[PDB]
Design an enzyme around this catalytic site. Structure first.
Site, PDB file in Angstrom:
ATOM      1  N   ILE A 101      51.110  34.853  40.716  1.00  0.00           N
ATOM      2  CA  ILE A 101      51.035  34.693  39.229  1.00  0.00           C
ATOM      3  C   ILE A 101      50.903  36.061  38.547  1.00  0.00           C
ATOM      4  O   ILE A 101      50.909  36.070  37.302  1.00  0.00           O
ATOM      5  CB  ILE A 101      49.867  33.773  38.818  1.00  0.00           C
ATOM      6  CG1 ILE A 101      48.510  34.355  39.230  1.00  0.00           C
ATOM      7  CG2 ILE A 101      50.072  32.358  39.353  1.00  0.00           C
ATOM      8  CD1 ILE A 101      47.322  33.568  38.718  1.00  0.00           C
TER       9      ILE A 101
ATOM     10  N   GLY B  40      50.627  44.206  39.795  1.00  0.00           N
ATOM     11  CA  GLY B  40      50.249  45.421  39.045  1.00  0.00           C
ATOM     12  C   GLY B  40      49.445  46.395  39.879  1.00  0.00           C
ATOM     13  O   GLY B  40      49.110  46.052  41.032  1.00  0.00           O
TER      14      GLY B  40
ATOM     15  N   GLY C  34      46.730  45.379  42.387  1.00  0.00           N
ATOM     16  CA  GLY C  34      47.253  44.671  43.569  1.00  0.00           C
ATOM     17  C   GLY C  34      47.887  43.349  43.153  1.00  0.00           C
ATOM     18  O   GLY C  34      48.510  43.301  42.068  1.00  0.00           O
TER      19      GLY C  34
ATOM     20  N   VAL D 245      47.722  39.020  42.352  1.00  0.00           N
ATOM     21  CA  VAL D 245      46.952  37.800  41.980  1.00  0.00           C
ATOM     22  C   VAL D 245      47.763  36.571  42.390  1.00  0.00           C
ATOM     23  O   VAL D 245      48.861  36.337  41.784  1.00  0.00           O
ATOM     24  CB  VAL D 245      46.589  37.760  40.484  1.00  0.00           C
ATOM     25  CG1 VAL D 245      45.846  36.487  40.118  1.00  0.00           C
ATOM     26  CG2 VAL D 245      45.772  38.973  40.074  1.00  0.00           C
TER      27      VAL D 245
ATOM     28  N   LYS E  19      42.548  37.561  43.877  1.00  0.00           N
ATOM     29  CA  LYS E  19      42.887  38.964  43.535  1.00  0.00           C
ATOM     30  C   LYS E  19      42.706  39.793  44.814  1.00  0.00           C
ATOM     31  O   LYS E  19      41.546  40.064  45.179  1.00  0.00           O
ATOM     32  CB  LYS E  19      42.034  39.452  42.353  1.00  0.00           C
ATOM     33  CG  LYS E  19      42.301  40.879  41.886  1.00  0.00           C
ATOM     34  CD  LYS E  19      41.610  41.291  40.604  1.00  0.00           C
ATOM     35  CE  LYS E  19      41.479  42.794  40.454  1.00  0.00           C
ATOM     36  NZ  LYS E  19      41.066  43.169  39.078  1.00  0.00           N
TER      37      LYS E  19
ATOM     38  N   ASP F  94      38.272  47.998  29.469  1.00  0.00           N
ATOM     39  CA  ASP F  94      39.676  47.515  29.391  1.00  0.00           C
ATOM     40  C   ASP F  94      40.023  46.435  28.347  1.00  0.00           C
ATOM     41  O   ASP F  94      41.144  45.906  28.335  1.00  0.00           O
ATOM     42  CB  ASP F  94      40.242  47.412  30.811  1.00  0.00           C
ATOM     43  CG  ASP F  94      41.764  47.400  30.895  1.00  0.00           C
ATOM     44  OD1 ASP F  94      42.428  47.744  29.841  1.00  0.00           O
ATOM     45  OD2 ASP F  94      42.273  47.036  32.013  1.00  0.00           O
TER      46      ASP F  94
END
Ligand SMILES: c1ccc(CNc2nc(Nc3cc(C4CC4)n[nH]3)c3sccc3n2)cc1
Ligand SMILES: c1ccc(CNc2nc(Nc3cc(C4CC4)n[nH]3)c3sccc3n2)cc1
Ligand SMILES: [Cl-]
Ligand SMILES: [Cl-]
Ligand SMILES: [Cl-]
Ligand SMILES: [Cl-]
Ligand SMILES: [Cl-]
Ligand SMILES: [Cl-]
Lengths: 344, 343
Positions: free
Chosen positions: B28, B31, B34, B36, B51, B144
């Site tokens: 799904i 990036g 790593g 997901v 993750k 973030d």
């Protein structure tokens, strides 16, 4: 249609203004800087682009001062400039009348990208050589562009002429004076800029130029990322983990990744001289990167120095070899390479 | 159908390994971090998100060490965690799966020339300030905050904060990298390269999400730091020499564009007020998370009558711990409305 008449100052000459009249005005561009109009000059019928910016009135415009100094076949020409107030609070606008150029490398790269084609290596050669020349020139005056990216490389698709535009971030870099680390667009920023360094050199433009080379080969950006962290990982995935030496020459929780062998990064039919070039443009240590001129002279560009080279559309190549003393000053001995036996 | 079985440590509680079996493994998300995977647990049939990340042999994973200390209704739960496998070792994080994100929701509305009903803006923003109040309580900064990192349950209106990959405890006097945070949501001190920034960066980012849901599009966009600072000045006016001092120099002199021109005509005044108070040049002049929870824009959530549009109850908004209120305990007297005290 409607006609505008202004009293405008030529860009190259001594301050002697004349009556310039123009028509067929239309918007083409928006952004932080301001607006860009396209127009046709009434006398010549030539098309011009007019970049309208807001003027401090307090200090003089650095873009304008830098552009008055510049004359190069691979840099957009300033024909005239004039002030207008229109209807802002006694607000004053500086209008830069530049050459109209009917394409950009951004638009062209994206046509080949959304067609799953790759831009024929010949164009990649023509465009990257004319960029490196334009950097050689402005670096000779100690001027750094600081915004080098595809959107800022104008093309004439008929002549294959590339023209560098957008000097709004350009500044003369004096060794020992510091400079802001928040310039340069995301994707093309040098690692030292990401690490926030303020003692960087003109080598930032070489890293940006290298990121354009890789992107024309791959058909998409090589170091993408919405954050700097994201950007650094995509870099460390290609160059591997910078050593303590290398970090010190740029400006600390770094993952240990062995360097991905360069030939394994591009599609397999990709010329090995194009890859060698990348490896020498995208180096961690700024001082270890090629110079613009050192780049122009790389074996990747050899096809352009063939006397029989012609454009796919059957026309001749544009000016590649009319170097000035200025342009060669970085390192004159290279002139014996850059100017081939057959060239006037 | 295929079935992976692992021995997993629980995220919360003590270290008693547990057999976990899942199926329908699917990607799904890709990036820098790593991969997901979504999966369906065999026993429960519950959906989870895994993750998978590269584990340094050097030190233990910080994202892990952080997420194991965290237990709050507006933060994704770490159910289990295991080591697995390129011929080196990966850390997997089994997390609640949550079927929507603010990024997606904002965008569904945006290209239908529509803004999200203000009631969801209040709900979503409220739950985010709660999560920040919680992690800030521990001196941990997310670093973030952005729409893509705000998970939603469209049915319950529960918002969950995810991605603690940049998150770090900020100790005063210790410096911190300025290259975290995603373009558009970066506080001006980070654009200016500052390394003595505090948790107030999370508040600036949150404020960019508020303003974006209201405006229908990002408020401070641009490809470069410079282009961003121009969009910021066109709205906040020119930073005074003292303002620049409090973040840490040749700026176009432009007047502060009244905040009510910025938003569409019928925008609530109290929405516009909360923005002007999150999006301040001076980091220490910005509302704390807990102070924002108690802003008058969130008054409608404290109404005992308040219902979601579908007629359902709002989720838990008032069950504050001591841990959550330590920033300012007296604030409990606005945060917990009378009707939530009733026995
Ligand atoms: C950056 C931002 C905006 C622009 C203006 N947009 C633009 N300019 C063109 N040409 C252009 C701009 C200029 C002066 C501003 C440099 N000369 N010629 C062309 S030709 C096809 C699309 C297109 N879009 C150019 C670069
Ligand atoms: C950040 C990074 C990666 C992702 C993975 N992509 C994702 N995740 C979702 N949910 C999600 C992620 C998680 C944990 C990995 C954080 N729980 N639930 C949903 S719901 C609709 C689309 C979608 N895409 C999400 C946020
Ligand atoms: Cl363009
Ligand atoms: Cl431009
Ligand atoms: Cl998303
Ligand atoms: Cl919704
Ligand atoms: Cl994530
Ligand atoms: Cl009540």
């Amino acid at each position: 249609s409607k006609v505008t008449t202004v009293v405008a100052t030529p860009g190259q000459g001594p301050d002697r203004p004349q009556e310039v009249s123009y028509t067929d005005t239309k918007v083409i561009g928006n952004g932080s800087f301001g607006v860009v109009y396209q127009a046709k000059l009434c006398d010549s019928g030539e098309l011009v682009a007019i970049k309208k910016v807001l003027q401090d009135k307090r200090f003089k415009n650095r873009e304008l001062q830098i552009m008055r100094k510049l004359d190069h076949c691979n840099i957009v020409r300033l024909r005239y400039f004039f002030y207008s107030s229109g209807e802002k609070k006694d607000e004053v606008y500086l209008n830069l009348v530049l050459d109209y150029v009917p394409e950009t490398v951004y638009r062209v790269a994206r046509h080949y990208s959304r067609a799953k084609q790759t831009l024929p290596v010949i164009y990649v050669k023509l465009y990257m050589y004319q960029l490196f020349r334009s950097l050689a020139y402005i670096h000779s005056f100690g001027i750094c562009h600081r915004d080098i990216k595809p959107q800022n490389l104008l093309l004439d698709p008929d002549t294959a002429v590339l023209k560098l535009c957008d000097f709004g971030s350009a500044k003369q870099l004096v060794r020992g004076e510091p400079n802001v680390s928040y310039i340069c667009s995301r994707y093309y920023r040098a690692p030292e800029l990401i690490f926030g360094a303020t003692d960087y050199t003109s080598s930032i433009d070489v890293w940006s130029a290298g990121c354009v080379l890789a992107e024309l080969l791959l058909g998409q950006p090589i170091f993408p990322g919405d954050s700097g962290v994201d950007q650094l990982v995509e870099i460390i995935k290609v160059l591997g983990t910078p050593t303590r030496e290398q970090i010190r020459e740029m400006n600390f929780k770094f993952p240990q990744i062995k360097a991905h062998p360069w030939t394994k990064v591009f599609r397999p039919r990709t010329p090995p001289e194009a890859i060698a070039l990348c490896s020498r443009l995208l180096e961690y240590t700024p001082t270890a990167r090629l110079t613009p001129l050192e780049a122009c002279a790389h074996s990747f560009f050899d096809e352009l120095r063939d006397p029989n080279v012609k454009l796919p559309n059957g026309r001749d190549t544009p000016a590649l070899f009319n170097f000035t003393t200025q342009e060669l000053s970085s390192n004159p001995p290279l002139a014996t390479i850059l100017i081939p036996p057959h060239a006037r």
